[PDB]
Amino acid sequence: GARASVLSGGELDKWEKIRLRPGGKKQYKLKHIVWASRELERFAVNPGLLETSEGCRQILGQLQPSLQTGSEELRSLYNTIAVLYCVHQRIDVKDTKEALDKIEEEQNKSKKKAQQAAADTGNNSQVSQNY
Ligand SMILES: CCCCCCCC(=O)OC[C@H](COP(=O)(O)OCC[N+](C)(C)C)OC(=O)CCCCCCC
């Protein structure tokens, strides 16, 4: 029926190791995986995505633009969803601050690719018309 598997044996060890903040005094715990699970379903997002390398990539997409005007809750999410994500992408980090950059820089490339051809506005061009 319902199969639960967020962090396997290996992901578990690394998880407990990773910290929420760079200059904090506490590491990651299940409390963060569950807390985000109950908060996800609230945003019309099933908690099953937390155990999917693809889901995280999506969940972060909605929080990315939200970070601008997000609250304490919205922030904590991007943090957890960030670490858990890197774990599913065969990525290794020490804290959330680092993992976050890995997710931001990874997307920065997509922008350069989807914003390289549309950057030559200047002299008048040619085009048909019927006026
Ligand atoms: C009882 C109140 C319900 C009001 C109506 C439902 C609102 C809702 O679904 O909010 C989530 C939000 C996008 O929602 P909307 O902005 O209402 O979408 C409008 C357009 N349609 C309906 C076509 C999809 O997108 C987000 O998830 C952004 C918030 C960050 C959370 C990300 C997951 C952690």
Q: Is the CB of 38 under 6 A from ligand 1?
A: no
- By what method was this entry solved? NMR
Q: Are 67 and 74 in contact (CB under 8 A)?
A: yes
Alpha-helical runs (H) found in the chain: 9-17, 30-40, 53-63, 72-88, 96-113
Which of 9, 1, 129, 22 lies closest to 83, judged by CA?
22
Residue spans of the domains in the chain: they are 1-131
**Amino acid (one-letter) located at 121:** T
- From residue 76, alpha-carbon distances to 35, 73, 93 in Å are 10, 5, 17
Cα(100)–Cα(6) distance, integer angstroms = 19
Cα(99)–Cα(79) distance, integer angstroms = 9
Query: What's the CATH number for 1-131?
Result: 1.10.150.90
Q: Is the CB of 40 under 6 A from ligand 1?
A: yes
Q: Is the CB of 60 under 6 A from ligand 1?
A: no
Cα(131)–Cα(124) distance, integer angstroms = 18
